Design a protein around this ligand. Structure first.
Ligand code: MG
Ligand code: MG
Ligand code: MG
Lengths: 779, 15, 138, 82, 69
């Protein structure tokens, strides 16, 4: 690895300091973690070129360039958040200021290396118009250039480039997202007979569309066809027409054959100015004049002669100097009116100022009081005071996002925020095929649950939903009494990779903690899922998922006893209507019926946005887009130990005669008796739902480890362990003697304490979720 | 910051 | 035409479903109860009604009964019959000042800060004694 | 006031401020870059589509009713158990 | 001009067949004869016909001899 870089440097004769920067960029963690911001969907993407997770601030600006670089051959490497560069530049005044700047990407190619910064259209124009000597446009190459970035590049043997989103071909992006699953595979081997069959069918017919080839009964599937596509045996232009639309994509054997096969206004504006009532009036005028235009005038005409004559004269005038005479009969009532403001200008200015500085303020003052204050100020200033109706009417002219944000806040103004309306064909909002974009979201189900055995109320369970954005099919549903914590995530994803088969490609997930954790990100990296993050307080970015909660309310949850629906009006609640006295459901049965609804009731129901049931859309998409059996994750023991979490370090030492220390407990295995792995660090994994069992990576295999308290620490969860540890620390804090926390104290706490309300609540929660586990496992 | 993971470059792939 | 168009069996079955499946402590939506009604009608062999029919006959049974069998008594309290005086008993608000006076507590919707250390002291509580005759804050 | 093109979902026209103004949907960007002959066929196809889906509310209601009836049977069993 | 559509007959089925006729011929018939009823009555139809100096005629109900051709 180092020798090839050294030969690269020698061939390109990069200076000592340039080699120093390249070496620093190559071996360094990214400077800053990408922040959600307020308008950018952020996240991480797995790259097989580098073989690591690369962070993008914007999924439609920087991410397309990342996709290109990942699938570009000229690029060797592309680091993200390279170390800051102190760009020196003279501003408009003339002062030469040095501003720290972090380029979006640092790209090392086969003949050059340097910095690449991703921006948008309007950002580039505002920065250019606000900084003449920092950005400018070269129409020769049609590229945006930054003076200090390129200057620093030229002082170091490197290059500097600005990637905008004008030059990105979105058809290319769609096709890359289509074939990324086949790209990530490593042993694509199409059967020779089937490949020959397709080669014959392709060579017998040039320009054959993808849809008209897939439908042929050649004993083949779509996985085979797309595998031939990705290996360039069959040439499809991944630059003009997307593969998601297989009815507009011609297929050719090679590139050469594909290339050969490829090789008055004012009057109309007057009509546009008309109203349906004006149109009807013009029609009436035409019907009145028409007998006078045919030599057969009527003997009974109520309309007087002068108006008929004027209409006829204007008809002739229009047919002379316009081209058509009907357009001369247009009234255009909209221009009429008195739009002049009747209030004096000083009265306006004062009332504008008062609406600005006394109504839209962090007080939510009512209109009457602000009008009264305005009237008092006007009477002090000797100007005309507007009436209350005028104040209410103008306040009604300021409604929308700005006023709601300046009065209630940014959370309340979000309803009237905006809709991003697609002009061109960007990447589709809800994906192109099944298992492309899946959203993950949790909620607190509005239903009270009693204990299965003792019958005491347990509260409202939490529901975790993973749902694909294409077919709306509820991919995986989970129910647990606990708050949002990884266990949640291991679970939904276990079921996903269990009853279905694999997993998403882009998984959006809000800015939780369960998602900013190390475990979820590491698992997504391991299984190569692009992690996308919506900005804080913004909900439309997972809107398709979130509304699936509301449906679950109306179709299954709000039609149950003890639902937490009437508690929205807390002020109207009585002991006769409290759901904690009406609740009868349990966690296991509620989960069972929720799964039934999500898997065979909502699954067979037709969707307005698909005109088919989610299962039918799923089947059609996976038939058109291929089954992609290679990306299947088999639900076996290997996946079982792969989903399990671990500590912060990742590995633990094997102390002789004691084992490995995980979460205050010690774990031992037979293979630990071997001195080869004794007093050495081995990777550890811990089961959150069964503490008494862990796993250790020894001699190229995960091996189970059992704690020394199996009869006393089996079946317990880890949340109960932290509860016991905290209570033990507090109980020993009731005394001055400092007894350290070890395994035996926790063991006798578990074997002695049985009536603690919080601990009993925890054991009840674990016993309840055990039945959900059994229901998942087929019981 | 507070509660935010360090900007580590996570390896990918199933071992 | 003040005559009903639906058959009487359908009317009775829809009344029963409204009484025993919509006026319940579950707050069921109209669509699901309508679907259950339609299924029961199809088993019973009676002509099923439309969703508009169900909505119209539910908005004709509105009041104390619906609000109490749906949300409770504290919610039906807004749909209460007022007391209207035919004869003149003793006046409700008072014949003279200091005759009927009301005591009532509340917590003021304002966060208060301390005058020395400036921490959040929470919302205060205001009690009012009001002369009900002149509505005066005594 | 509104006008619509039977040959184009992507286009509408509304009367705002005294101007017949173009109005954009979604089957516009999604149907951008195609001819005017397949556009109208896809347009008619989506009209019947969005209709016919409104009519299938009966089957969804029936399936919901069956599911809720099973739910209520379990409700009664578990309430009588207690 | 020929229109095939899933919509029921109305002035929508005529305002769009006249459009196809203008597309493939560039003009309009001087007198257009249409069906009776309130489903073929509009302001846009008649303003279109009156714009290009055309005429509309409506057959009488229950007598198809006028449209016998
Ligand atoms: Mg909820
Ligand atoms: Mg009070
Ligand atoms: Mg209050």
């Amino acid at each position: 690895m180092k020798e090839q870089f050294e030969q690269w440097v020698a061939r390109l004769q990069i200076s000592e300091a340039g080699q120093k920067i390249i070496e620093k960029v190559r071996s360094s963690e990214p400077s800053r973690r990408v922040g959600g911001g307020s308008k950018n969907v952020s996240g991480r993407y797995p790259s097989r070129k580098m073989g690591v997770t690369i962070q993008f601030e914007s999924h439609r600006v920087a991410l397309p360039i990342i996709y290109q670089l990942e699938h570009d051959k000229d690029v060797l490497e592309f680091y993200d958040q390279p170390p800051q560069i102190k760009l020196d530049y003279q501003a408009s005044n003339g002062r030469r200021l040095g501003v720290l700047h972090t380029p979006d990407l640092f790209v090392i190619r086969t003949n050059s290396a340097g910095w690449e910064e991703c921006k948008t259209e309007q950002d580039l124009k505002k920065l250019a118009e606000k900084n003449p000597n920092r950005y400018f446009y070269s129409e020769e190459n049609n590229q945006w250039h930054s003076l200090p970035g390129e200057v620093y590049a030229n002082q170091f043997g490197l290059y500097h480039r600005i990637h905008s989103d004008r030059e990105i071909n979105w058809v290319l992006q769609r096709n890359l997202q289509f074939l990324e699953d086949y790209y990530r595979s490593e042993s694509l081997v199409v059967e020779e007979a089937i490949a020959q069959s397709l080669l014959a069918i392709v060579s017998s017919q040039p320009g054959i569309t993808l849809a008209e080839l897939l439908n042929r009964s050649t004993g083949a599937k779509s996985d085979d066809i797309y595998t031939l596509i990705i290996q360039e045996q069959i040439y499809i232009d991944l630059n003009a027409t997307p593969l998601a639309e297989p009815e507009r994509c011609l297929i050719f054997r090679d590139e050469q054959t594909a290339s050969a096969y490829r090789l008055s206004t004012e009057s109309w504006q007057r009509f546009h100015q008309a109203s349906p009532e004006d149109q009807a009036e013009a029609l009436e005028r035409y019907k009145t004049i028409e007998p006078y235009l045919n030599g057969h005038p009527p003997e009974n005409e109520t309309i007087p002669a002068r108006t008929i004559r004027h209409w006829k004269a204007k008809y002739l005038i229009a047919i002379q100097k316009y081209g058509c005479g009907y357009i001369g009969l247009l009234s255009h009532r909209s221009v009429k009116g008195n739009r002049q403001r009747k209030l004096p200008e000083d009265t306006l200015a004062i009332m504008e100022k008062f609406i600005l500085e006394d109504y839209e303020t962090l007080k939510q003052k009512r209109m009457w009081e602000v009008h009264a204050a305005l009237v008092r100020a006007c009477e002090e200033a000797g100007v005309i005071a507007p009436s209350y109706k005028a104040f209410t009417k103008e306040v009604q002219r300021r409604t929308g996002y700005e006023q709601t944000k300046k009065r209630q806040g940014r959370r309340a103004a979000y309803q009237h925020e905006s809709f991003y309306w697609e002009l061109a064909i960007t990447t589709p909002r809800h994906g192109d095929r099944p298992f492309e974009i899946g959203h993950i979201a949790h909620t607190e189900l509005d239903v009270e649950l009693v204990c299965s055995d003792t019958g005491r109320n347990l509260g409202r369970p939490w529901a975790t939903f993973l749902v694909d954005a294409y077919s709306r099919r509820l991919l995986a549903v989970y129910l647990t009494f606990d708050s949002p914590s990884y266990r949640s995530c291991l679970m939904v994803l276990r079921i996903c990779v269990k009853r279905h088969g694999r997993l998403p490609q882009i998984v959006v997930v809000d800015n939780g903690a369960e998602f900013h954790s190390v475990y979820f990100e590491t698992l997504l990296a391991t299984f190569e899922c692009t992690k996308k993050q919506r900005p804080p307080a913004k909900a439309r970015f997972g809107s398709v998922c979130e509304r699936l909660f509301g449906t679950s309310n109306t179709q299954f949850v709000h039609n149950l006893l003890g639902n937490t629906q009437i508690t929205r009006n807390v002020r109207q609640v009585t002991k006769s209507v409290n759901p904690k006295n009406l609740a009868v459901w349990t966690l296991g049965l509620l989960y069972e019926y929720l799964c039934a609804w999500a898997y065979e009731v909502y699954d067979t129901d037709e969707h307005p946005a698909l005109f088919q049931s989610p299962r039918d859309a799923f089947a059609a998409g996976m038939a058109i887009g291929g089954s992609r059996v290679h990306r299947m994750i088999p639900y076996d023991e290997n996946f079982q130990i792969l989903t399990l979490p671990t500590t912060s370090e990742g590995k633990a030492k094997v102390q002789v005669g004691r084992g490995i220390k995980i979460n205050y407990i010690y774990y031992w295995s037979n293979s630990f008796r071997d001195p080869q792995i004794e007093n050495t660090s081995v990777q550890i994994r811990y089961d959150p739902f069964n503490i008494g069992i862990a796993y250790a990576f020894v001699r190229g295999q995960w091996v189970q480890c059992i704690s020394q308290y199996y009869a006393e620490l089996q079946g317990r969860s880890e949340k109960e362990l932290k509860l016991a540890s905290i209570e033990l620390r507090k109980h020993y804090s009731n005394h001055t003697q400092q007894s350290k926390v070890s395994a035996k104290n926790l063991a006798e706490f578990l074997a002695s304490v049985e009536a603690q309300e919080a601990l009993l609540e925890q054991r009840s929660y674990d016993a309840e979720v055990k039945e959900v586990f059994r229901v998942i496992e087929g019981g | 910051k507070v509660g935010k993971r360090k900007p580590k470059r996570d390896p990918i792939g199933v071992q």
